[PDB]
Paper text:
The domain search performed with Interpro database1 revealed that BacA is identified as a DUF 2170-containing domain protein (Pfam PF09938) belonging to the YjfI family. Nevertheless, the functional dimer conventionally described for the T3SS chaperone family does not correspond to this « asymmetric unit dimer » but is reconstituted by symmetry related molecules, issuing with two dimers each one being formed by crystallographic second order axis. The Tb-Xo4 molecule is localized at the interface of the two monomers present in the asymmetric unit, participating in the stabilization of the crystal packing, trapped by the N-terminus and Trp-39 of monomer A, by Glu-112 of monomer B interacting with the atom of terbium, and by Arg-136 of a symmetry-related monomer B. The 3D structures of the two monomers are very similar, with a two-layers alpha + beta mixed domain, and adopt the α-β-β-β-α-β-β-α topology characteristic of the T3SS chaperone family, with an average root-mean-square deviation (RMSD) of 0.6 Å on Cα for the 115 closest residues over the 139 amino-acids that have been crystallized. All the variability is localized at the N- and C-terminus and in the three loops linking the beta strands on the surface of the protein at the opposite side of the 3 alpha helices. Only 8 residues for each monomer, 3 at the N-terminus, 2 at the C-terminus and 3 in the loop 130–136 have not been constructed due to the absence of electron density (see dotted lines Figure 5B). Two residues present alternative positions, Glu-90 in monomer A (A-Glu-90) and His-155 in monomer B (B-His-155), these residues being localized at the biological dimer interface, in close proximity. One molecule of glycerol has been trapped in monomer A in the concave surface of the twisted six-stranded anti-parallel β-sheet in a pocket formed by the side chains of 4 residues (Tyr-72, Phe-84, Glu-95, Leu97). The location where is found this glycerol in molecule A corresponds to the region of interaction between the chaperone and the effector in the structure solved of the complex formed between the multi-cargo chaperone CesT and Tir from E. coli, Tir being the first translocated effector in the infected host cell via the T3SS.
The present study focuses on the PA14_16140 protein, i.e., the PA3732 (BacA) homolog in the PA14 strain. The role of BacA in rhamnolipid secretion, biofilm formation and virulence, was confirmed by phenotypic experiments with a bacA mutant. At a molecular level, quantitative proteomic studies revealed an accumulation of the BAC cognate partners by the bacA sessile mutant, suggesting a negative control of BacA toward the bac operon. Finally, a first crystallographic structure of BacA was obtained revealing a structure homologous to chaperones or/and regulatory proteins.
Numbering used by the authors:
A (entry chain A), B (entry chain A): 37 to 131, 135 to 177
Write the structure that this text describes.
């Protein structure tokens, strides 16, 4: 009737991307489980997958705020270039502050939609470093 | 086999929100059509709905960049508060620069998902003025 970390992890495990080992599930058992996806073909990029009532959040880390030469100019450029990355947008997090790439989809989206979002966010993260490299230090 | 402005406008027209007059379709005929949704219950807030290959874009205007007291501080706050608005994120556009609220969903999403995104984005726009008012001039 709606996704939870456990049910979503099971569904994802049965897809080709995971059955083939190109990605793997890391479900953290606890009070309420936390789902992580490791994109093996993106250098083991970990992706956080969390249902949250009004949306399913899919998030990955970009680079620390310290790696940005001009945070002021980069912030404005981020808001001007939403078009650059389909289905996901860049954010700022706290622990040192880090730039993230998050996607959001309906709490009742299909498995294919959730899968597509994860795959797209991973590709977007690599694309961010490729299209924003000029703003980085080294 | 995938949404276009015309087919999406037809589907939306048959939903309760539009059959009741609480929202209405404004499809601009031309070379390739452009779809707009007027949220009558949000002060006739116009919403742009456009399919674009890798995503369906849903966008509305927030306020001109001139209405923001400290664009530098507001930009950083926007990136820190993604959680504030589910399913949509804030951006910057050009004609004078204006702050926008855009949502993105799969090119094959269900009508209910597209409808939910539009409704949520409208509510988010009102919420943005309510939660960010301190950053505005008057």
């Amino acid at each position: 009737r709606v996704w939870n970390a456990r049910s979503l992890a099971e569904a994802l495990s049965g897809t080709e991307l995971f059955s083939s080992g190109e990605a793997q599930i890391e479900l953290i058992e606890g009070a309420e489980a936390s789902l992580y996806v490791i994109m093996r073909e993106y250098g083991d990029l970990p992706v956080f997958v969390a249902p949250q009532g009004e949306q399913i959040i899919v998030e990955a880390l970009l680079w620390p705020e310290s790696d940005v030469t001009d945070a002021t100019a980069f912030n404005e450029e981020v808001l001007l270039s939403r078009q650059l990355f389909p289905l996901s947008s860049i954010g700022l997090l706290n622990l040192e502050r880090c730039y993230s790439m998050f996607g959001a989809l309906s709490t009742t989206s299909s498995l294919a939609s959730v899968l597509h979002e994860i795959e797209t966010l991973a590709g977007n993260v690599i694309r961010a470093t490729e299209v924003y490299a000029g703003y980085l230090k080294a």
